[PDB]
């Protein structure tokens, strides 16, 4: 399983953000509002979660051979990931997720505060003009082979278009001492 593919727990579905390594052990990053749901996932056991405030969580793989260091492009192809970086305003980006597949757009803001009402407030979010839908959360925000974020939320959808916010991937990596595969 690669970046942007479905990960579920009981009836819930989220998308995998990035396959990473912690002291050589294979794990996967995804959104924290996803991992708060349960410790048991199709791919393994949750070993960390942070939502709200942040929006990231981590799952250790039951099957290490499934830790595919790429992002699925939903066209029978994949993008290799080799590093993690920080987003910049005007950057050309892509987002891969299990509901809508691959979408593209550009970063329009950084360090954005997002109020999700009863779900709480998140801070320091990457802002883009890329669309997303329910099910797309936790999936990959990348630029080429550089990992940049995890889908959190937004407004709109993929037909009318909308605004999406992502948790910066480097803050999740440093939280857990992880490195992208």
């Amino acid at each position: 399983i690669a970046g942007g593919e479905a990960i579920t727990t009981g009836g819930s579905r989220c998308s995998l953000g990035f396959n990473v390594s912690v002291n050589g052990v294979a794990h996967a990053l995804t959104a924290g509002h996803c991992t708060n749901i349960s410790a048991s996932w199709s791919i393994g056991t949750r070993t960390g979660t942070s939502f709200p405030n942040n929006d990231y969580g981590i799952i250790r793989h039951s099957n290490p051979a499934a830790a595919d260091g790429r992002v699925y492009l939903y066209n029978g192809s994949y993008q290799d990931i080799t590093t993690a970086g920080n987003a910049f305003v005007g950057q050309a980006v892509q987002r891969s997720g299990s509901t809508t597949g691959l979408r593209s757009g550009s970063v329009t803001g950084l360090n954005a505060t997002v109020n999700y009402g009863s779900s709480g407030i998140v801070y320091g979010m990457i802002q883009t003009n890329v669309c997303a839908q329910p099910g797309d959360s936790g999936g990959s925000l990348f630029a080429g082979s550089t990992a940049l974020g995890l889908t959190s939320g937004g407004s709109g959808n993929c037909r009318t278009g909308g605004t999406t916010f992502y948790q910066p991937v480097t803050e999740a990596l440093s939280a857990y001492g992880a490195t992208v595969l």
Binding site: A31, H33, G97, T99, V114, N115, Y116, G117, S119, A132, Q133, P134, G135, D136, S137, T151, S152, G153, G154, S155, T164
Partner: peptide, 4 residues
């Protein structure tokens, strides 16, 4: 304004 929602979580995906």
């Amino acid at each position: 304004f929602x979580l995906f």
